[PDB]
Amino acid sequence: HSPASGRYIQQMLDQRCQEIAAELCQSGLRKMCVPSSRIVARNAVGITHQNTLQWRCFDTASLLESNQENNGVNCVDDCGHTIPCPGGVHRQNSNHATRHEILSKLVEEGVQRFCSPYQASANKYCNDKFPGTIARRSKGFGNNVEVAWRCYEKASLLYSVYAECASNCGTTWYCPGGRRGTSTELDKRHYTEEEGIRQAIGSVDSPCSEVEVCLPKDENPPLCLDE
Ligand SMILES: CC(=O)N[C@H]1[C@H]([C@H](O)[C@H](O)CO)O[C@@](OC[C@H]2O[C@@H](O)[C@H](O)[C@@H](O)[C@H]2O)(C(=O)O)C[C@@H]1O
Ligand SMILES: [Cl-]
Ligand SMILES: [Cl-]
Known part of the structure; x- marks a missing residue:
């Protein structure tokens, strides 16, 4: 045991996103038919006109290695705060599913347990x-x-x-x-x-x-x- 955050909220979000991508694939959404190593939750802008910060399930193969202006991705600490983490959103080519409500509710649940x-x-x-x-x-x-x-x-x-x-x-x-x-x-x-x-x-x-x-x-x- 290190004296350190386990990043449990983030881990719960990525698992929930892997589940959502798997359901979308079963629904026929071909681009979501990926291994779970390809799916994470990020709090970020989306494609063009998706300009607010929302919780979305991203295919990491569509993320840029780095960000320019308003396009960086955020991860979440175990008190529910969103913080820049590596990567950027491709505003034309992003492959993601915005799931703001379910993912926010998992954050609130995690904050009670972990913060x-x-x-x-x-x-x-x-x-x-x-x-x-x-x-x-x-x-x-x-x-x-x-x-x-x-x-x-x-x-x-x-x-x-x-x-x-x-x-x-x-x-x-x-x-x-x-x-x-x-x-x-x-x-x-x-x-x-x-x-x-x-x-x-x-x-x-x-x-x-x-x-x-x-x-x-x-x-x-x-x-x-x-x-
Ligand atoms: C500019 C900015 O966003 N943050 C500054 C910050 C704030 O201006 C300050 O806390 C406002 O209340 O100040 C920082 O320096 C603190 C340091 O500032 C000197 O002016 C002073 O000589 C010192 O006694 C001391 O207050 C900070 O770290 O808080 C720098 C920061 O970039
Ligand atoms: Cl933390
Ligand atoms: Cl949702």
Whole structure:
């Protein structure tokens, strides 16, 4: 067991999408008759005129290796936040099935099971103060060593990079969506909020007695062990 998110919500979305592609194929939709290694869920734009961010089931063979403007794909952390992950949508040639309602409902279900109350609290602090941001302890602009608690705009995070987050005991944990400390415009898009985030984390009630030891887990609740 690593002290890290299992990315269980994302895993549930991809499985549900593999099921939907298999049903579509059975319905005659030939382009969806693929092995399950070819299907993932992404939160993204679709083809031309599909311009909002929706949960869709994509054939990875139709995804671009990288994105230009508004066409990147997003994956989801175990608190239900969407974060850039590798790939881009081909606006003419994408092979996908938009399934926003079922996939959103699985995200809400997963958030109840997996999202650390301590992380929920830190994310809420960030969102209230800077709409759209989530909390990580990670890199800032042009410095690839130093970490601090910051409210990060989700578009500036990288799902493939794990960064420190709060476990469900309020202890060190690592979650997808991190910074590299590089020097691009995206690397500027955060608000360092060391005191406010730490207080938000500290205000959460322990799931354990003041005499028990909280051992965190990648799904709620953590272990409470007698001292
Ligand atoms: C421009 C942007 O999106 N984020 C800035 C961020 C914000 O301007 C700030 O948090 C707004 O409240 O500031 C960052 O620098 C913090 C740093 O800023 C200096 O001006 C000051 O000298 C320092 O005391 C300190 O506040 C941040 O990390 O928060 C940079 C970020 O790019
Ligand atoms: Cl997570
Ligand atoms: Cl749906």
